[PDB]
């Protein structure tokens, strides 16, 4: 009791310590503390007597009573994705088959008007971060046995596959990747928030009535933030003025497949509406397309790795150096094109590996002084800036050879900073028997390297292609 | 499409970088 207080205070101090070479050691340090607290607590404060599926009939009845679609599908525990919706009749592509009225959602607005409302006005984090407001909304209603939203809360999972639930050795597979630093931040964010709100809830007057004051475990918080990150959605407010974050019951039981977004908010009728992404025959699982997220984002925020994610990408940080003889001119061209002199870009799995904005950056980054002047002076300078991201209008063959040479060298260098090779990773997946979470970790580190390798090959092809145009003295597109 | 909904949209959980 008083020992949990001292433990969380220690946790708050360490997790508020600034960024520290030593990121893995800090992660293991925080982990050791977190696990010490968790092992001294009783797991989830509120648990339900039934199995998860025993509550799906109540969800359907409650949703039906409040105007949601409840016919044409059923809940099924699928091995690959967990629970999901399965069609009980044939559903045709583009059919409006699912709808959920606003009254059923949990939103920041409904959090503010809940028992959490006093604390929400007083606390700066809750007012500034709707995702965290949503998480505590979820916890308070979970502990309120007569909550309007109990039918939804009693059908949520009780654990997730976000990295907050990984073993240390499962995270260890990600050492030397880009992704591990986002795993580190999420762990430290969540530990710091648990410690801070544990203190707040124990002492703040406006929290005295919260059921969390009786019991608020680390398990509770990890559960609530993972529920929110894997399921939250952005929707308009009632008046269409602003956006807010919302949990959307029933429809959020749909699992993910490749495609286009087919879910939208109907403001005139004040409900979420989902049309069929494809034909679903009776007996087929109903999927939606979650969004164009990277596999790092799917693993870290959504808790799964999606094979054949055509939107996969890795980050690359680039910038014009202040030590560049042409820094001022390059900075001005970038500013006129609306591009910063330094930021993080992406390398994409699909061809081409770079976006128009990264192509524009690389062209400027590789420009001679005469080329830069052509982008700053004269009536055509604005037109040149306009086409700076267009692969069909090169500044010059020479500029292209230089930028593609740079990208090939840089992607190759990045590949050399990984602890394992692509072939070693494929051998591990082939010959080791792994947990779901371990396989997520290894497929993520493999995919980072596969994206880089494709960028090396694409850049090599482009460099050679533009070398030939430069040798054949070919004319530039006008 | 009126107000497309990206399901599980990525949000910022870093209270220190945001406050
Ligand atoms: N294509 C996919 N492959 C594996 N898991 C998936 C998936 N699409 C969705 N999921 C899972 O579903 C979660 C989103 S909520 C969707 C319903 C969920 N399966 C449930 O049982 O409540 C994700 O965090 C992930 O666990």
Numbering used by the authors:
A (entry chain A): 22 to 41, 44 to 501
B (entry chain E): 67 to 85
From the paper:
In both substrate-bound and product-bound structures, the β-actin peptide lies in a narrow groove formed by SET, iSET and C-SET, with the unmodified or methylated His73 residue snugly accommodated in a pocket composed of α11 of iSET, β6 and β12 of SET, and α12 of C-SET, and η5 of SET.
By using the core region of SETD3(2–502) with the β-actin peptide(66–88), we succeeded in crystallizing the complex and obtained a 1.95 Å structure of AdoHcy-bound SETD3(2–502) with β-actin(66–88). On the basis of the density map, we found that His73 of β-actin had been methylated in the structure, although we used an unmethylated peptide. The reason for this could be that SETD3 bound to the methyl donor AdoMet from Escherichia coli, which we used to express our protein, and that the AdoMet-bound SETD3 methylated the peptide at His73 during crystallization. Therefore, this complex represents a snapshot of the post- methyl transfer state, which prompted us to crystallize the substrate-bound enzyme. In the product-bound structure, His73me is inserted into the same pocket of SETD3 as in the substrate complex but the distance between the installed methyl group of His73 and the sulfur atom of AdoHcy is 3.2 Å, with its density map distinguishable from that of unmodified histidine. Despite the fact that the methylated peptide adopts a 310 helix at its C-terminal end, the substrate-bound and product complexes are highly similar, with an RMSD of 0.19 Å over protein Cα atoms and an RMSD of 0.32 Å over peptide Cα atoms, respectively.
